[PDB]
Amino acid sequence: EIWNARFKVGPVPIFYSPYLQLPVGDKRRSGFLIPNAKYTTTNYFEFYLPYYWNIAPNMDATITPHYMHRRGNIMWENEFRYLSQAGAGLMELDYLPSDKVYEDEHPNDDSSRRWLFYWNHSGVMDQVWRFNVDYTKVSDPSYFNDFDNKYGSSTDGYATQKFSVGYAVQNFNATVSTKQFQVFSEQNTSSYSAEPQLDVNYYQNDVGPFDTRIYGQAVHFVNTRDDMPEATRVHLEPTINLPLSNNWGSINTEAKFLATHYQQTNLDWYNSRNTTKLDESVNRVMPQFKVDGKMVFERDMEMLAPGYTQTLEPRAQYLYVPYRDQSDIYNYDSSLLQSDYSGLFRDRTYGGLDRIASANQVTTGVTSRIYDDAAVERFNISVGQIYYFTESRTGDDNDKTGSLVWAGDTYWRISERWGLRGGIQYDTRLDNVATSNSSIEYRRDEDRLVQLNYHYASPEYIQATLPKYYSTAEQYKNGISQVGAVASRPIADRWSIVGAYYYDTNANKQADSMLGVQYSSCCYAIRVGYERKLNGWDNDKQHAVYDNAIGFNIELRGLSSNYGLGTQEMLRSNILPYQNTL
Amino acid sequence: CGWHLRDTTQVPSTMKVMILDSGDPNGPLSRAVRNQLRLNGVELLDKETTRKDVPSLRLGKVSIAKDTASVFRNGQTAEYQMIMTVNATVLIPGRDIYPISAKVFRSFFDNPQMALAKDNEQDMIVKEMYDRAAEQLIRKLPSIRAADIRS
Amino acid sequence: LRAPSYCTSFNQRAQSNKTLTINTPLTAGSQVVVALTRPVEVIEVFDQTLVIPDPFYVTSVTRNGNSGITLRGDDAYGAYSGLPQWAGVIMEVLAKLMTCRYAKRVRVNGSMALPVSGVPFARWDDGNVSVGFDGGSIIVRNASYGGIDDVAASVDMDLVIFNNNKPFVYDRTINIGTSDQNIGNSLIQLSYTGALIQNNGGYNHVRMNGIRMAGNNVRVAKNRVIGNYSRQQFQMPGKNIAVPTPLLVIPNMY
Structure with a gap:
């Protein structure tokens, strides 16, 4: 129902890294570059006029006055690249003297200047010390949304200024860093920052028969809001393991100790509005015991193709962690981890240090592989599960014993051009499949390929993992069931046709559709694209909203490079980009 | 039932002792490779050692790609597909090099x-x-x- | 024309999940009238390290029977729980009575504090502004501006305030909505009429809802901004809520 268009003409975009790589043939000598142009049905006409300046062998700059018709002014993009004894870095400063759209959209602000400053740095003093800077600042909270800045990092809508100093040798690592946010009075998003954070690692092996590893961390959490709690956390984690290996099997026993100290302040607004009070000083101490084993069998597969070998690789793991109540510790950095077959053997449930769930479980898995006469693996299939002897309780959380989840994997290499992949997460105590994905692809070269897809996700899984308002919204609750197909074919020797079609079998409505053609010559390339895709909701009749886009692109190459037909660049232009999978 | 315990070893006896070389010896991939080789009985060696008679494992470029895999009913990203490729070359002393590569797939919501x-x-x-x-x-x-024997 | 007798006024948080109970003596065979002044409350709920705004609004008012009343509510997404703060005045149609203790034509400039505590009634004519009532002040905003800014506006209104001079007499109640409803030469009660969440400028723009009176027709219009939450963290489905609770209407005899 909504249509768009794009018309871009310019030189082939070449990149030269943010850090200078020493003067190479006097770079390119001072002078203007090939200007670009762009017309869109939304932002109208735009023009770029880059200019390259070679100040010194170690310093160069680029000035690109960008003219935007809708805003009715020119925004000056300045770029600085240097290389001193300390290291190499980049400086960027965009500046729009006055914005016309901003005045209408934001009447409260008195001035309509728009600017952004970005500074990067990197330097390895001697051969151990390392320094890094990542500085970003913007004039208004709506800068990142309005403009497509070439450089600049935004986290949760805030511009982040990050510094770090690191020391690294073969066995010892030390890193201290601080990160801050640029918060405006019109933003209410909550986010935590580490000002500062210290990480220390130390590995020492061959301590008799054992190995040893120490890990420690001290961090201070400060929120962008004045009512959220703050804390200072100190962590220590000594580990020691005894790895035993054989020709056919191996077993690894590891013992680890976890010690964490908390110091929480600003616990008034949260404490008043919640029944569970956060303690000022919390000390968490837990040991951990883990035993991992593996065996490998093999067989000469003679009834099928001769000279092939089939293997069987059972694997079992036992993990024990005591239960400690963690309701008095606020959750600063801890989220539940989604798992696959390889994740069944993970010893952590949450990503972070705030929540450490108890564990009394045994994991089991079987993997079978097939090798050809050249000892090259062609096929492998894996099955696993986790058996819980005791519910994994993290103190607060929200039958939980026995075999609850199963996972699988598959990868068949039919030929040098054919490939097949799989994956499933069967969930017991519901008798339904939680997630699954499959793919089969034929690919001769970079321009000839056909692919098929399937992605599934049950409504129960979405309700269980995703936030609570997902299970009530009509655009999230039904789950995922999507079938796709990608194709490409280089007709003649100067053309290339690609396409993709993705269908949602749950709603019987397509999700994506693409068709592109590119004519490649020895001096220029012309590309035409089309795409129909979902682009939001309606909230009135509760139906999705589609968007149609037509793209016209002209490239001026003039360099006699390889300059492929255009495939692998168009294939990654829709909202569901192609991936090799082979 | 012709099954038997694996008679052949994981890392061939020609590669029981080898040199690990990489662009960042203190990086994460180098640490992972060192850890994995140790559990298999391989005795690591210094890059500038005095022995010119051991294979060399030279780690190469690492590429990580993250892209959308499926979408919700409003076009919002549902799951991501994460692919990491790793290139390496094994230099057998006296013979030619042998390129190898690894590709890892990971999908999550x-x-x-x-x-x-x-x-x-x-x-x-x-x-x-x-x-x-x-x-x-x-x-x-x-x-x-196996390929070295064919040469 | 009904002349209810003042019973009590309340302003407190719900005791249970979306349930507030007010206990006051009542007489049998009496029509209880509840005039809500704070029917909406945007609560920031927590969901695994995520502070999410969620409007809580009153859904039903139930008479317990000669002992008090209870108000039950719901949230926009119906997935979270909380204790909202609601305010209002309870009156009975069958001894103290509310009286007109303020009556003047004023010019509210963005926000004006209440000259005297009580229940405010007003009427105006501007078709580009919306008027709300947070509990202690009258909020006037620009309803024609589709942005993320808190743009104020000015309007001329006939303000009448009742508390406990002529007795408070009301004739009809109206259920405000998205379509114009004529009310004639009469004054309407001032309060928020819901909340709004929309995708605006890469933000989860949250706004309150007011009253738009042009000519003699009233409906729901956007009001003061509650906050802006970036869509880079999380994206929320759009919601536009008009509370089902009625609004009192009184004749223009003051």
């Missing part, structure tokens, strides 16, 4: 989380991805020994 929680989750995912890539790289060593 886009769970809305705070910045720190998302960063920790991504770091854990990438670390596990490196571990699996090192495991894949180790399994290609027997194929190299």
Whole structure:
């Protein structure tokens, strides 16, 4: 129902890294570059006029006055690249003297200047010390949304200024860093920052028969809001393991100790509005015991193709962690981890240090592989599960014993051009499949390929993992069931046709559709694209909203490079980009 | 039932002692490869050692790609597909080099989380991805020994 | 024309999940009238390290029977729980009575504090502004501006305030909505009429809802901004809520 268009003409975009790589043939000598142009049905006409300046062998700059018709002014993009004894870095400063759209959209602000400053740095003093800077600042909270800045990092809508100093040798690592946010009075998003954070690692092996590893961390959490709690956390984690290996099997026993100290302040607004009070000083101490084993069998597969070998690789793991109540510790950095077959053997449930769930479980898995006469693996299939002897309780959380989840994997290499992949997460105590994905692809070269897809996700899984308002919204609750197909074919020797079609079998409505053609010559390339895709909701009749886009692109190459037909660049232009999978 | 315990070894006896060389010896992939080789009985050696009679494992470029895999009913990203490729070359002293590569796949849902929680989750995912890539790289060593014999 | 007798006024948080109970003596065979002044409350709920705004609004008012009344509510997404703060005045149609203790034509400039505590009634004519009532002040905003800014506006209104001079007499109640409803030469009660969440400028723009009176027709219009939450963290489905609770209407005899 909504249509768009794009018309871009310019030189082939070449990149030269943010850090200078020493003067190479006097770079390119001072002078203007090939200007670009762009017309869109939304932002109208735009023009770029880059200019390259070679100040010194170690310093160069680029000035690109960008003219935007809708805003009715020119925004000056300045770029600085240097290389001193300390290291190499980049400086960027965009500046729009006055914005016309901003005045209408934001009447409260008195001035309509728009600017952004970005500074990067990197330097390895001697051969151990390392320094890094990542500085970003913007004039208004709506800068990142309005403009497509070439450089600049935004986290949760805030511009982040990050510094770090690191020391690294073969066995010892030390890193201290601080990160801050640029918060405006019109933003209410909550986010935590580490000002500062210290990480220390130390590995020492061959301590008799054992190995040893120490890990420690001290961090201070400060929120962008004045009512959220703050804390200072100190962590220590000594580990020691005894790895035993054989020709056919191996077993690894590891013992680890976890010690964490908390110091929480600003616990008034949260404490008043919640029944569970956060303690000022919390000390968490837990040991951990883990035993991992593996065996490998093999067989000469003679009834099928001769000279092939089939293997069987059972694997079992036992993990024990005591239960400690963690309701008095606020959750600063801890989220539940989604798992696959390889994740069944993970010893952590949450990503972070705030929540450490108890564990009394045994994991089991079987993997079978097939090798050809050249000892090259062609096929492998894996099955696993986790058996819980005791519910994994993290103190607060929200039958939980026995075999609850199963996972699988598959990868068949039919030929040098054919490939097949799989994956499933069967969930017991519901008798339904939680997630699954499959793919089969034929690919001769970079321009000839056909692919098929399937992605599934049950409504129960979405309700269980995703936030609570997902299970009530009509655009999230039904789950995922999507079938796709990608194709490409280089007709003649100067053309290339690609396409993709993705269908949602749950709603019987397509999700994506693409068709592109590119004519490649020895001096220029012309590309035409089309795409129909979902682009939001309606909230009135509760139906999705589609968007149609037509793209016209002209490239001026003039360099006699390889300059492929255009495939692998168009294939990654829709909202569901192609991936090799082979 | 012709099954038997694996008579052949994981890392061929020609590669029981080898040199590990990389562009960043203190990086994460190098650490993962060193850890994986140690559990298989391989005795690591210094890069500038005095022995010119051991194979050399030279780690190469690492590429990580993250892209959308499926969408919700409003076009919002549902799951991400994460692919890491690792290139390496094994130099057998006297003979020619033997390129190997590893490709790892990982799919997960886009769970809305705070910045720190998302960063920790991504770091854990990438670390596990490196571990699996090192495991894949180790399994290609027997194929190299077979190809060396053909030469 | 009904002349209810003042019973009590309340302003407190719900005791249970979306349930507030007010206990006051009542007489049998009496029509209880509840005039809500704070029927909406945007609560920031927590969901695994995520501070999410969620409007809580009153859904039903139930008479317990000669002992008091209870108000039950719901949230926009119906997935979270909380204790909202609601305010109002309870009156009975069958001894103290509310009286007109303020009556003047004023010019509210963005926000004006209440000259005297009580229940405010007003009427105006501007078709580009919306008027709300947070509990202690009258909020006037620009309803024609589709942005993320808190743009104020000015309007001329006939303000009448009742508390406990002529007795408070009301004739009809109206259920405000998205379509114009004529009310004639009469004054309407001032309060928020819901909340709004929309995708605006890469933010989860949250706004309150007011009253738009042009000519003699009233409906729901956007009001003061509650906050802006970036869509880079999380994206929320759009919601536009008009509370089902009625609004009192009184004749223009003051």
